[PDB]
Amino acid sequence: IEIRKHLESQPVYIFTSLAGGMQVILRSNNLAAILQGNGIKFEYRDLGTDEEAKKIWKRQANGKTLPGVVRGDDYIGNWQEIEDANEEYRLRELLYET
Amino acid sequence: IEIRKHLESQPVYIFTSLAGGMQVILRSNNLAAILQGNGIKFEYRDLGTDEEAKKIWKRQANGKTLPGVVRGDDYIGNWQEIEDANEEYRLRELLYET
Numbered sequence: 001i002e003i004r005k006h007l008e009s010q011p012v013y014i015f016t017s018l019a020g021g022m023q024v025i026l027r028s029n030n031l032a033a034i035l036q037g038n039g040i041k042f043e044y045r046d047l048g049t050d051e052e053a054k055k056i057w058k059r060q061a062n063g064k065t066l067p068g069v070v071r072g073d074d075y076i077g078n079w080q081e082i083e084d085a086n087e088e089y090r091l092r093e094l095l096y097e098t
Numbered sequence: 099i100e101i102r103k104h105l106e107s108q109p110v111y112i113f114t115s116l117a118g119g120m121q122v123i124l125r126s127n128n129l130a131a132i133l134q135g136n137g138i139k140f141e142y143r144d145l146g147t148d149e150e151a152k153k154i155w156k157r158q159a160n161g162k163t164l165p166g167v168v169r170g171d172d173y174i175g176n177w178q179e180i181e182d183a184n185e186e187y188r189l190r191e192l193l194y195e196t
Contacts, residue, residue, distance in 0.1 A: 044142045
């Protein structure tokens with residue numbers, strides 16, 4: 001094709017569960033703050049009501065915990081990983097080269 | 099045109115705030131249960147991170163409380179109203195004739 005990104009044009013989601021306990025929604029706020037802090041728009045996906053989404057976290061997350069970020073179809077990181085990437089100033093890299 | 103619905107084809111959202119306290123996320127689960135109970139697919143919108151959405155609840159909700167349902171651009175009901183509509187077996191009517 002080109003060196004056209006398009007990975008930038010792709011839906012960013014926070015995967016989460018509103019039935020997951022306060023810790024998880026708390027971790028979900030923190031994750032949104034980072035995303036919003038970094039210019040990154042995003043929509044939430046509930047794993048209580050989105051079979052399609054439960055089945056990405058299933059495949060890809062290696063059953064890691066709490067909320068996490070998915071770009072289009074492709075898992076990226078979870079609250080901890082993302083917290084890591086962000087501190088190491090590597091967030092947009094995990095995000096747009098996976 | 100026709101008597102083509104299309105209102106059925108339109109995005110249904112639960113408007114909410116993950117920073118709104120446990121009551122609000124609790125009320126958000128209850129609202130999702132009704133929606134899911136009734137065959138109605140939906141995506142969440144956060145008013146902490148969606149300026150566009152804050153500005154529909156602003157206009158339309160007459161500052162009513164906690165989560166609520168919006169079809170495309172058009173407010174419908176809030177957790178209480180929806181709870182009402184559902185018990186009076188009128189949910190799909192509020193939903194698809196507003």
